[PDB]
């Protein structure tokens, strides 16, 4: 009863799913799991001047995201990654910007924006030829190792690893440069997932297209293995203007595939693939940091 990833992706899209709370101009960089049968969503916020983070009050249906409470974190967790770490029965929120390049906090209740532990170092390395430094981390474990993947707004994708038994912990400064292309082709927003029912991992990377932001996909048989381009052009993207079915945005940008199993394996079901992304009105201009990003959800057409 298993499904495979398609060679060509076709989606349908929701409209804009929520408007930012008073004081914010954008909701961004989503990470989501299903928790107690409800959607649990963290994201970045922007006021235009400063970036913060938030969690939505849990909601069962995407169509009710618009009415969900928006709960600011007292300490910013920009571009967050949320998961449940089963081997230690603890939730993890990883993010960027703070005392170290990447940071994490832990909790027993991921619904509380302010119930997270003191910040701990996740990654302390540095990259060359980048205006941003390490950005847009994700974490994913198989049965043996925990992996860190990240970007640099510079055409490179990077990876680090540790035995799972040493996590939660600090990857330190070391990393592997696993992919190298143009800045436009491998920009940011990297995510990695286990494809349920297949001996396959899925990587998506946000690219800058002629028509807007879009995602390029790659596959691997192992998390330490090589990545083969799948749907990796603007005309044949993982998700973008070409195939999103979205009428409100020409950009499909930093988000997360919907993870029903909240655990560290980042497993997605190819039979019911959905993508919580950020988009924006095509008419919106101004400084990048003030852009009015909004959540939407793509559902894969089978
Ligand atoms: Ca992310
Ligand atoms: Cl590695």
Swiss-Prot record:
<keyword id="KW-0858">Xylan degradation</keyword>
<keyword id="KW-0326">Glycosidase</keyword>
<keyword id="KW-0624">Polysaccharide degradation</keyword>
<keyword id="KW-0964">Secreted</keyword>
<comment type="pathway">
    <text>Glycan degradation; xylan degradation.</text>
</comment>
<dbReference type="GO" id="GO:0046556">
    <property type="term" value="F:alpha-L-arabinofuranosidase activity"/>
</dbReference>
<dbReference type="GO" id="GO:0046373">
    <property type="term" value="P:L-arabinose metabolic process"/>
</dbReference>
<keyword id="KW-0430">Lectin</keyword>
<dbReference type="GO" id="GO:0005576">
    <property type="term" value="C:extracellular region"/>
</dbReference>
<keyword id="KW-0378">Hydrolase</keyword>
<keyword id="KW-0119">Carbohydrate metabolism</keyword>
<dbReference type="GO" id="GO:0030246">
    <property type="term" value="F:carbohydrate binding"/>
</dbReference>
<dbReference type="GO" id="GO:0045493">
    <property type="term" value="P:xylan catabolic process"/>
</dbReference>
<keyword id="KW-0732">Signal</keyword>
<protein>
    <recommendedName>
        <fullName>Extracellular exo-alpha-L-arabinofuranosidase</fullName>
        <ecNumber>3.2.1.55</ecNumber>
    </recommendedName>
</protein>
<comment type="similarity">
    <text>Belongs to the glycosyl hydr olase 62 family.</text>
</comment>
<comment type="function">
    <text>Involved in the degradation of xylan and is a key enzyme in the complete degradation of the plant cell wall. It has a specific arabinofuranose-debranching activity on xylan from gramineae. Acts synergistically with the xylanases and binds specifically to xylan. From small arabinoxylo-oligosides (ranging from arabinoxylotriose to arabinoxylohexaose), it liberates arabinose and, after prolonged incubation, the purified enzyme exhibits some xylanolytic activity as well.</text>
</comment>
């Amino acid at each position: 009863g298993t499904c495979a990833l398609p060679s060509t992706y076709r989606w349908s899209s929701t409209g804009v799913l929520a408007q930012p709370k008073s004081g914010w101009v954008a909701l961004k960089d989503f990470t989501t799991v299903t928790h107690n049968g409800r959607h649990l969503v963290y994201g970045s916020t922007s006021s235009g001047s400063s970036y913060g983070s938030m969690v939505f009050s849990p909601f069962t249906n995407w169509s009710d995201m618009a009415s969900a409470g928006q709960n600011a974190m007292n300490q910013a967790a920009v571009a967050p990654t949320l998961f449940y770490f089963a081997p230690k029965n603890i939730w993890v929120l990883a993010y960027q910007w703070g005392s170290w390049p990447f940071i994490y906090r832990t909790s027993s209740d991921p619904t509380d924006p302010n119930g997270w532990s003191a910040p701990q170092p996740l990654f302390t390395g540095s990259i060359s030829g980048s205006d941003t430094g390490p950005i847009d981390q994700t974490l994913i474990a198989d049965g043996q190792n925990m992996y860190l993947f990240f970007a640099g707004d510079n055409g490179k994708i990077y990876r680090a690893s540790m035995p799972i038994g040493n996590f939660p912990g600090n990857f330190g400064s070391s990393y592997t440069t696993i992919m190298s292309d143009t800045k436009a082709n491998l920009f940011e927003g990297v995510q990695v997932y286990k494809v349920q029912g297949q001996n396959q991992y899925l990587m998506i990377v946000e690219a800058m297209g002629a028509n807007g932001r879009y995602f390029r996909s790659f596959t691997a048989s192992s998390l330490s293995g090589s990545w083969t381009p799948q749907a990796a052009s603007e005309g044949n993207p993982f998700a973008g203007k070409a195939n999103s079915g979205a009428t409100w945005t020409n950009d499909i940008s930093h988000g997360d595939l919907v993870r029903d199993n909240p655990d560290q394996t980042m497993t997605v079901d190819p039979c019911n693939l959905q993508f919580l992304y950020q988009g924006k009105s095509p008419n919106a201009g101004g400084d990048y940091n003030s852009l009015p990003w909004r959540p939407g959800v793509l559902t894969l057409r089978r």
